[PDB]
Amino acid sequence: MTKEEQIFLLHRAQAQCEKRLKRPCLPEWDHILCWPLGAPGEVVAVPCPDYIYDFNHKGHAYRRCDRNGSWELTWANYSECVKFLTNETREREVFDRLAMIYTVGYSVSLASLTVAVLILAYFRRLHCTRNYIHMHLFLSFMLRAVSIFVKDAVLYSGATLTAAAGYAGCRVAVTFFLYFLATNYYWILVEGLYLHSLIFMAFFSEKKYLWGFTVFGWGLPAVFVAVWVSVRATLANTGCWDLSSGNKKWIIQVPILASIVLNFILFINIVRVLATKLRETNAGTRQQYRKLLKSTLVLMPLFGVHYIVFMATPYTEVSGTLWQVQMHYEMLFNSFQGFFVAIIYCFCNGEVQAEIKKSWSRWTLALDF
């Protein structure tokens, strides 16, 4: 990846030191620095290099050449150069908590979203366009979960542990990662549009909207992903597609950002009419306030309202107040969102409970000997 360019720069540096070659201590290249004419019996101080972002540039590397034109019996002082690896290692401890909590969340949200799709698929009378779109949502949560586990495996092999197999594996991994991630936010936008269309149109074509939403859901992200793959593979096409290039990262960021503000507007528009529907049942109180509260709490995980709290923030420093607050908050809610939209909508549904009770009653009646 970047490590090959680093080696290439070192090779180029070696060539540059050789061209200069084409009683003082003679100049030589020792695979790190090209040394000027040394003074006999005196220390030669060469500044810490200026092409490493993470090293303190200011310090000086002491190396004494003796009176015979040889290096002191090789001595070198690198104390000044290494002033930030300690801070690095300390910041490494913080990242493991976050790396664990999304694994826990996407384990719980994997387990609790297989029962839901089993029940919905298995039962005959729970088949509807509504319960098709809910199934596409739950299967998008599942594909998200497995696209996290797959990504985690290559992250593990990269961290703790051939190379070219790793590369192409990484490219396929990252592509399916930021495809299955992209489709989830568009499918919550689809549910936003469907609930916004039922209320505000009063009639709908099941087949037209079903095939329209299915295509809008699955097909349209693959165009964005494809364009990103082609552009990245045109300009860079080196290493993994993990390192950012520049503005090109926005190619998939910006069509997703403009599916969360819009989806939030759809949320606040729909809530307003619920105020009307409650008010119109008063003329025809605290009870209405409680019902509105309940409706809000069972409509905020679905449309992802909490996203807007930190959706638009510019990229901050790796360590800091805002970054840790944001990332902890977001990783917690992004992880438990699956389990919440499972429990609130599938487990607590009245018709599902009724069906389960009736099936259980039939099983008990069948066991009579």
């Binding site: 990846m1 970047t2 490590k3 680093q6 080696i7 490493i52 993470d54 090293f55 690198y78 150069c81 290494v82 690896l85 690095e88 990242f95 976050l98 999304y102 992250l155 990269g158 961290a159 990662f177 930021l178 991630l181 936010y185 993994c240 993990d242 390192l243 950012s244 990262k249 960021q253 997703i256 950002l257 930190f310 959706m311 638009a312 923030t313 990229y315 790796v318 970054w323 944001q326 990332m327 977001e330 990783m331 992004n334």
Partner: peptide, 30 residues
């Protein structure tokens, strides 16, 4: 931005520092 994508870029930026670290002090490695 998207938190998981933001996290990926921050993690990727952090991880890509094994050449300079491994090259400058091989003594811990050896």
């Amino acid at each position: 931005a998207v938190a998981e994508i933001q996290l990926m870029h921050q993690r990727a930026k952090w991880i890509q520092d094994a050449r300079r670290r491994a090259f400058l002090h091989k003594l811990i490695a050896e």
